[PDB]
Amino acid sequence: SKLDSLKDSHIFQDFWQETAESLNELKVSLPEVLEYLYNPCYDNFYTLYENLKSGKITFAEVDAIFKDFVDKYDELKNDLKFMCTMNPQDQKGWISERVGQIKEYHTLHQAVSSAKVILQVRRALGVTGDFSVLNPLLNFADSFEDFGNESPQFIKAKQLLQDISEPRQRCLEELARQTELVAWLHKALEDINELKVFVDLASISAGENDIDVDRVACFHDAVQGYASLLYKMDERTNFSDFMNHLQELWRALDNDQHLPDKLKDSARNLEWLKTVKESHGSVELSS
Amino acid sequence: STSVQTGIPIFLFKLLILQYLMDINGKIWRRSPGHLYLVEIPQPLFKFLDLFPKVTCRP
Amino acid sequence: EEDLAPFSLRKRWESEPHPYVFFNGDHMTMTFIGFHLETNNNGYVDAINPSNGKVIKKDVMTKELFDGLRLQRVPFNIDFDNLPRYEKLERLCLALGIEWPIDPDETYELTTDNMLKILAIEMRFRCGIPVIIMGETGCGKTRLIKFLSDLKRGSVEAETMKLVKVHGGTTPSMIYSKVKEAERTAFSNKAQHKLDTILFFDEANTTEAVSCIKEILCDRTVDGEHLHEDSGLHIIAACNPYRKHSQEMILRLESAGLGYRVSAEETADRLGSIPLRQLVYRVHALPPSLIPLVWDFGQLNDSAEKLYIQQIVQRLVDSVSVNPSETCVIADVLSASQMFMRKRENECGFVSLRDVERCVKVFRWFHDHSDMLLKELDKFLHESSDSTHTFERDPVLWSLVMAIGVCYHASLEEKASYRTAIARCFPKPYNSSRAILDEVTHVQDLFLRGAPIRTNIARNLALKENVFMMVICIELKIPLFLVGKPGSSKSLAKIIVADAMQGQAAFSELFRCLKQVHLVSFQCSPHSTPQGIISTFKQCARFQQGKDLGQYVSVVVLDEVGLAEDSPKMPLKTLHPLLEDGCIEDDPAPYKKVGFV
């Protein structure tokens, strides 16, 4: 009956398998499953229940147990209803403050990863500029603390990076990791207005099959999606105009969700893109 | 030879009895009274080879 | 077996006594080789072989005649265990009639049965008896005859031995043309250097034209025209033995994936009532009047096999800077793996001494590349594991573990027994089977992650194994054959490999450091001619020409070779030469040897 009341708790199934790997290939009988296997699960689960009812849990168990719930917040509210159906009392003031605490914690660590990738793109683009607000965040990133309480002084700092996403760090790391192409485009192409003749000059030296043709459109959509950043930046910008141009970058992102994979698949064709401009007469007539 | 499994009595009937070998897009071969054709066949077939004038050889 | 009874019943092996006398050509002495002369108490002298006591043929020699042979000082009754190399070489040149010898191969050892085989073959084409040798592929047939050719020529730069690799698609007209050109060059070599030419048909049992070879040597005729007796030309033919597979592998072969396209009783490729599908060597029946002329070599009795694999590994490690002692570790782990293949009622195709040099080639590929592979493995195991798999790895022992991972461990089905029987030879980091299994698991995970990312994929051990084996054997141009059920994730592996194994446009860094691959596919059918297969090989070789072959590999992918199995057009008969030198009816070259999946 207690397992029937607790099968829709993903945390319970996690606890089940991480304490039942703690027994090792054994043919075992049913009455000792209840004592040798069930009672430690129920005792650990009830101590965990009275912990979440009080709030004495540490952050280490918070990011060690709840790691598979990131940006999946309906199952955890439903899971806390199923979690409190075990001991039959009210559920009014317990769920919403800790779900809010877990949302601020998740956006905090998301903001930490965003800060690391934005300093990496700040280094690889060559723009020195000035941010000066993600220094205590990095001094916290190598810090380690053990408590379960709600961090206030960072909230206003996190108002600049509230709504970025769990994606778009992919876009920032595709900028920050493809450095040879962005150096080659600042060296060799240098402006937006030669693209319309460069596409036509590449469309001869490309093949006739469909991958070979669509490399050109992948390059075109990649540089049209990143032209707000790789060509219009001054070398010393502050944070406010940086997010102000990233705003119209998000408008540029809303028409095409596939732009960082287009950047990567264009970035692994740099040898062809170097062959485009210095191409001699490529003597293959066509099919 | 011994690795000529599945063609012997048709060929022997064409050349030795029907006296011909024919290519339908070309020439035709006629066995002639005036040449001797010895056909060395080792050893079903044992009864078909009996029809012909046979010189058997022994250890 | 009743269908193999004239062939498989070897009435004697080499290991039964060979008492030989010869009368020397230029010198005026005698050679008593292969037997000893002992005195009987009846006043007579008998012949007794070494290595045991057998008193065969009592009452042979009188003792006063034996005293006479003391007086005229014949080299009588000499065992060749305690002779040095120069003395055995001068006994060879006195016996073979060679004047002014050198030693052409110092690595090639001369034990007493190698003298008896050399002198036996030389007697057989000194008097006129045809030379047909029935031995396996592993035993030293081509090395012994090349030593005989290099000894009989002495020092002359001319061409004496010509080795014709007979395969299953070897037509009679090629063999006739090769015997005529060998006859022409035999006349030319006798005219210029007074020297005779050997024509060695290797594997002269796989073709239907074996009776044609019977025309060449049993009655000395080329397509109706006679061979000149005073030309100087000797034909040696070698044959593969006849044995049926043990029944458990025929069980695992009839059930491998979907079974055979034809059955075992309505198949057309037979020898007797046995299919050639169920034989170890695909041999046709020898014609009679060569059955009483064939005779057997040794079988490599597993004592000297360690010596041969040691010479092969020391000649292919290139140990100018590898190791002094780990070469012996390679040698005895390969001996242990070969003995594991022997300690079972079957092997795959009795691949001894050719799987070993291929596997040393794989080891050389890994050890040449064991600088970025270990950095990527360090990165992967740090980002995805604990510190247990984060130890420093030896760039020679890791490559040996992966060599036996892809040579032997991939094909076997009893893999855990192989791992626990091969872990008794490895040093400290690989004493357990679990360490070898973990290491091959992490590197298969490394190559699957080096591919572009896929979601909703059947990420299992079979896909990892197929991707890992296919990447390696496309890099090394080893052919690989893959049979599975029709959902085995064996064509998904083809897709993700062909998209990941791009040369410089690769996704990750490991595949960026490897070759570029363009593959030409050909889906086989029961109505498949061999001309399509030849055209596919010539097309991929046409892709491969003009390019840097260290950064470009073409690979044919044949998609339904199970459907081309016993098709009466026989398209796979041409496959065996096209995988060896890359082209039939042409001399080999670069840009012709291509990969095969």
UniProtKB/Swiss-Prot annotation, chain B:
Name of the protein this chain belongs to: E3 ubiquitin-protein ligase RNF213
Taxonomic lineage from the root: Eukaryota, Metazoa, Chordata, Craniata, Vertebrata
Subunit structure, interactors included: Monomer. Interacts with UBE2L3/UBCH7; UBE2L3/UBCH7 is the most efficient ubiquitin-conjugating enzyme E2 for the ubiquitin ligase activity. Interacts with UBE2N/UBC13; promoting 'Lys-63'-linked ubiquitination of target proteins.
Record's function text: Atypical E3 ubiquitin ligase that can catalyze ubiquitination of both proteins and lipids, and which is involved in various processes, such as lipid metabolism, angiogenesis and cell-autonomous immunity. Acts as a key immune sensor by catalyzing ubiquitination of the lipid A moiety of bacterial lipopolysaccharide (LPS) via its RZ-type zinc-finger: restricts the proliferation of cytosolic bacteria, such as Salmonella, by generating the bacterial ubiquitin coat through the ubiquitination of LPS.
Domain notes: Composed of an N-terminal stalk, a dynein-like core comprised of two catalytically active and four inactive ATPase domains, and a C-terminal E3 module. The ATPase regions do not generate movement but rather act like an intricate molecular 'switch'.
Traits of the deletion mutant: No visible phenotype. Males and female are fertile and produce normal-sized litters. Mice do not spontaneously develop Moyamoya disease, a chronic occlusive cerebrovascular disease. Mice are however more susceptible to Rift Valley fever virus infection. Mice show elevated expression of MMP9.
Residues the entry annotates as binding ATP: E40
Organism from which the protein derives: Mus musculus (Mouse)
Gene, per the UniProt record: Rnf213
Disulfide cysteine pairs (residue numbers): none
Family, per entry: Belongs to the AAA ATPase family.
Subcellular location: Cytoplasm, Cytosol; Lipid droplet
